[PDB]
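Morning!

As promised:
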Amino acid sequence: MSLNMFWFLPTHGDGHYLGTEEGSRPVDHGYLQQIAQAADRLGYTGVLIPTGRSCEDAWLVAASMIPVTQRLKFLVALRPSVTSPTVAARQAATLDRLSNGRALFNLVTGSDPQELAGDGVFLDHSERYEASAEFTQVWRRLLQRETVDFNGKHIHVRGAKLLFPAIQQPYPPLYFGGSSDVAQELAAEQVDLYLTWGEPPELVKEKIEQVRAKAAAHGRKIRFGIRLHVIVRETNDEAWQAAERLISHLDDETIAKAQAAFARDNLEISPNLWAGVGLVRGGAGTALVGDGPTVAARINEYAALGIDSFVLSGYPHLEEAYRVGELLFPLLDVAIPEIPQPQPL
Amino acid sequence: MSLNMFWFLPTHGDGHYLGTEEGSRPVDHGYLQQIAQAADRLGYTGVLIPTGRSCEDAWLVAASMIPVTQRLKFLVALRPSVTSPTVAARQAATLDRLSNGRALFNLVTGSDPQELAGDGVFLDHSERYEASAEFTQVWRRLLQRETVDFNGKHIHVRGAKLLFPAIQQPYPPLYFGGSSDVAQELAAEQVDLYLTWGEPPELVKEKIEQVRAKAAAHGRKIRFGIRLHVIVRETNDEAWQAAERLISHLDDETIAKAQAAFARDNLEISPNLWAGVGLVRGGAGTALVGDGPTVAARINEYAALGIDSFVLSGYPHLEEAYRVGELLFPLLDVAIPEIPQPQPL
Amino acid sequence: MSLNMFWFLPTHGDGHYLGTEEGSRPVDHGYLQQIAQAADRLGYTGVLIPTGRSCEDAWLVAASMIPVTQRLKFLVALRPSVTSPTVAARQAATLDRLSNGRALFNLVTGSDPQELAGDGVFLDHSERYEASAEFTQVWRRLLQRETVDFNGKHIHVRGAKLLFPAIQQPYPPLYFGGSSDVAQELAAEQVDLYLTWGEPPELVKEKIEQVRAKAAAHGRKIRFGIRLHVIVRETNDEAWQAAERLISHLDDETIAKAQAAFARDNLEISPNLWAGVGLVRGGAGTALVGDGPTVAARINEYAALGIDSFVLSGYPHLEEAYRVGELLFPLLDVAIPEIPQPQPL
Amino acid sequence: MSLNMFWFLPTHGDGHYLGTEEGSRPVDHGYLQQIAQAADRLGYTGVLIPTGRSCEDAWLVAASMIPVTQRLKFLVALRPSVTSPTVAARQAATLDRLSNGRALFNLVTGSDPQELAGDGVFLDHSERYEASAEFTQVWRRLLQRETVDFNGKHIHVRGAKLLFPAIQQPYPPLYFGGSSDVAQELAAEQVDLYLTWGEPPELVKEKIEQVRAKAAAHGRKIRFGIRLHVIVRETNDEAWQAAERLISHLDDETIAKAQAAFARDNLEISPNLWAGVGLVRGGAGTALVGDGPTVAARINEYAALGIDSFVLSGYPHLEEAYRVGELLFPLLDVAIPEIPQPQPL
C-alpha cells in the first residue's frame, strides 16, 4: 500500500493570502503549467482540477497540459445534468486517448441551484442525485463500449455509442464523494474511489466503514481518498506560524465569527488539523499543520483507515507542491507513477 | 486583402487513400501535433477541427495543441442542442484565454437524427435551426459579459453568466455555413463569417451575394470563406495523377456510380475543380487539382468573389500541408499570423 | 537481433532535389523539431546529426530537441583536434544527463585540411589519426570517472576530471567508421560500433570481417552499422522513378561525368543499390531503391552480415521518415525504443 | 532607461541552505526548465548560465531551453583558451539561430590554473588575458561574417569563416567583467556591457567611471550591469531573518572567521548590502537584503550610476524568481521582453 499523492491546480486563483487579492497571483496557462510540471516531476500521482463557474474549464485545462507532462494524471470533474452523458463519455475517451491513459474522473453533483439555473438545470436536492445516478450509469456503460438506449426520469438517449475506446480498462477511474446518505450510496454502487473530507481520524473512520459497508451490500469494494490542505514546515512553530500568516488578511469579523463557531486556535479541531483554511470557500475545509513527522504521522494514521489517495493543496500552489514533495514525501511510502509507453502504431 | 489560409486536423483518420484502411495512418496526439506545428510554422492562419461521433472531441484536441503552437488558431465546432450554451460559452472563454486569443468558433447544426438521438437530442429539421438560433443568441451574449435570462422554445437559462472574459473582442470570431435558406439567414444575422463549400465560381458567387444581401437586411456585413480540398503538384498531370491515385482503392461500384451521377473525369465539375474527393463522406466535397499557378488562379478567382478565408485539406494531411505551403503560398498573397504577446501580469 | 533504425537530421539543408536550391526547404529549429518528433514517434532508435562548417552545431541541435522528444537518441559527432577532450567529455556528460541517457557519440576524424586550418588544426593525414586515438583515449577515461594525466604527441591534460557522471554505463556508446586501415584499427580498439558505408553486400562483408578480426586482436568484439539513403515506394518503378526525380536538377555535366565514372543506370552498382545520391557530397554515398520487400530484403541481407544498426535518410527528410517508417518498418524486425523512466530524486 | 532584469540558472546545485547538502535540491533538466519558464513568464530579460567544471555545460543547457521558452534570453559563458574561437563562433551562431536571436555571451577568462590545466590550458596570469583578447578579436570578426587569418601569440587560425550568420546584428551582445585593470581594458575595447560586482554604490560608481573612461579612450561607450543576490521580503526583518536562515548550516568556523574578516552583521558592508552570501564560492558575493522599497531603492541607486542590467539570484532559485518578480518588479521600471516573430521562410 503505497500512497498516491495528488496536488491541486488552482484554476480559480492562487496566492499567499486567503480572502484577499493582496499577494494573489494571476492564474494563466503558463502558471498552471508550472504547477503541473512541478507535480509531474516531484512524483505526484496526479492533480485535481476543480469545477464551477468560478473556475476555468477543467477539461480544457487538463488537455492543455498533455504535451507538457508525461506521467501525471488529471482528475477532472464530471457534471451530470449540466451536460449530456454521451458527450461527456466521448470527451472522457478523448482525454484518455490524447494523454495516453492519464485521465481520472471525479463526479460532482451540483449543489448551487443558482449556478445550476445559470446552466439550464432546475432539479430539487433529490432529483439532482437521481439524475446523477442515471448519468453515471450511462456514462460508465458508454466507456465499456456499449450501445445504450436509456430512458429514465432525467436521462434519455437512444442508440448512444462511443466510436473511440478509452485507453484505461474497464474505463478511466471514477471518484465521487459526499457525506449525505444518498451520495454515499451512489459511490457505494458505481464509483471506484470514495473521496472524503479531512475530518478528525475518528469521524473519517466512521464514514469509511459506512461506505465500505454500503459498498459490500452490492458485492463491491471501493477505494478511499481524503482531501487535505497541507502546511508542512521544518518545525511545528513555523507550520502554525505559516497557518496564521495565511489568514492574516481575512476580515476581522470573519476571524471573530470563526472563533465563536468553534466553542468547546479554536480552529484546531484535532491535533494538527486546522480548520482555518475553510473560512473562505473554494478550497479544502481542513489543513494538516505541523512539521514533517507530525504531518506524516497524521497522514499515516489516515492511511491506516484504508485511504490510499491524498488530494493535497497549499498556498501558493507552485511553491507548496515543492514544500510537500520535499518535507513530506521522504517521510512517507509514496507511490511513484510511471511514464506510459507509447501505444503501438 | 491578404488571404487567411487554414488547414485541417484529420481527427477521424488520415492516410494516402480514400475509402480504405490501406495506406491509412493512425491518428494520435503525436501525429495531430505534427500537423498543427507544421501549419503553425508554415504560416497558416489556423486549422479547422471537425465535429461528430466519428471524430475525437475538437475542443480537447485544440487545447492539447496550445503549448506546442504559438500563432496558429483553432476553429472548433460548436454544437447547439448537444450542449448547454452557458457551458459552451464558459469553455469558449477558457480556450481563448489559455491559447491567448487563438480560438475560433464554427457553429454546426446537427443533421444526423441518429447521431443527435445518441446525444439526447430529438428535434425536427426546423427545430434544429430554431434551437441553433436561440443557442447562438445566448452564447454570444454570454461572451459579451452579459448576464442572460432566456426562455425560448428550446433554450432556457436563468441568470447565466461567465465569470471569466475571453481575450478576443467582442468575442472570439464565429463562423457558420449552409446553403439552406434557413442557415443563410442564421449566418446573415449572427455569425461573422459565412463558410461556403467549393462549388464552381459562378455558383459560389450567387450564394455570397445572397448572404451578403441577407446580411445587409440586418444592417450587417459578414466575411466569407470557402472549404476546399487541394491536390497541387509541380505540373497539371502529376496533380490529376495524384487525384486518380487518391481514390484508386475505392469500391468499383462507387466509382461506377459516380460516373453515372455526373452525366452531361465526369468528376471535374469545373476546370480543375474535381468532385472525386466527395465520393466518401468525412472531408471536403470538391478539390482544386492542378499545378501551382492553376490552383492559385482558381483560388484568386474565389477571392475576387469576396472570400478572404480558405479552409484547405490534403492526403496525407502532414505532407500536404507542406505541399500547399510550398507550391501554393508563394503564388498567393497569404496573410501571415503573428505570435500574440503575453498578456500583462 | 532486432534492427535499430536511425534517421538523419539535415542540418545543412533539406529539399526535394539534389544539387539545387530549387524545391529546397529552409532548415530551422521548427523544421528540425518536426523531423526529430517524427522519428521519435515512428519508432526510430535515434538520429545522426552531422558535423562540419556546413552544418549547424550538432550538440546544440541535439540539446534543443530534448524537451520535445522522449525516447529518440541523438548520435552527434565528436571532433578530436578541434576541441579539448576534457571539454567534450564534460559536454558529453551534460547531453547524456539532460536527455536522460539518450546521447550517442560518433567520432569523426577531420579530412579537410582547409576546414581544420579554419579551426586552428594543422595535422598531416597521419597525425590526424594519432591525435584522434589520444583524444578518444582521454575522452573515454574521463567518462569512466577517472582523473586523467595525459601527455602524448598531440593531447596534453593534467588532472582532468568530470565532476558530473553520465547516465549510460560505462559511458555513452561510441561509434566510428572509415575504410582506411588506420581508421579500422582505431575502431577495432576503442569504439563500440563500427559504422560502414553502404557498399554491395559482398564488399560490406569483407570490411566487417576485417574489423571483426582487428577487434578480436584486442580481445574485443564490436557492433556494426551501415549508412544508407532510402528511396522506398509502393512499387519498384515508383522507387526508381523517385530516384531519377531526385537528381533531375543536377548539372548536365555532372550526370554525364557520373555515367563515364561507372564503366563496366550505371549508378546501380548492385541490385537496388543506386549511387546517384552520391553525385553531390553532404549525404550518403548509396541508396537502396525499390519497393518495400526488395528494400527489406537488401536490408536483411546486410543484417545477416552482422549489422544491427541502419542510419537511413531520404529527401525530403520529414516526409521520407514517414515513407520508410510506413513502407519498410512493417517488413522488418525493428527494435522499438522505450521512454526512459525519470531518474530518482 | 527601463531596467533589464536577469535571473540565474543554478547549474551547479540549488537549495534552501548555503554550504550544506541539507535542504538542497537536485538540479536536472526538469528543474532547470521550471526556473527558465518562470523567468520567461515573469518578464526577466534573460538568465545567466554559469561556467566551470562544477557546472553542467551552459551551452547545452541553454539550447535545451529553446523550445520551452519564448522571449527569455540566455547569457552563456565564453571560455577563451579552453576552446577554438572558430568553433565557439559557430556554436554562437547556432544558438542564436535556433533560439531566434535570444543568445547573449559573457566572456570568462579562467582564473583557476588547476581547472585550466585539466582542460589542457597552461597560461600565466597575463597570457590568460592576452589569449582572451586574441580569442575575442577573432570571435567577433567571425560573427560579422569575416574570413579571418589570425596569427597571434596564442590564437592561430587560417581562413576561418562561419557559413551561417547569427540573427542579432552586428553580432549577439557580449558581456565581460573584472576589476583588474587588464580586464577593464579588454571590456573597454571589445565588449558591449561591462558586468561589475555588487559593491557599495560608491565603489561601483568609481569602477564604472574608470571603464567608461577607458571605453572613451577607444571612441567607444559601453553599457553596465551589476551582479547581485536578492533576499527581498515583505518587511526588513523577514528579509534579514531570511538572510540569517540561509547561512544557518554553515560551518561555525566559517561564520566565526567571516566576522573577523569584517572588522571596522559585520557582513552588512553597506546599508542592505549583505556579504553573507559570499561565504561560500559559487554564487554572487553580495546580496541586497530588505523589503520591496528598500531593495528597489538600492537598485535604483545603482541604475542612477548608469547600470541598465541586473543579474539577480536567490535560494531556492525557482521560488525566489517569483519572490523578486512579485515583490520587486512592481516597484521598478522593468523592461519587458518581446517574443521575437518567426523569421520569414
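DSSP finds eleven helices and 15 strands in chain B.

Hope this helps with the figure draft.
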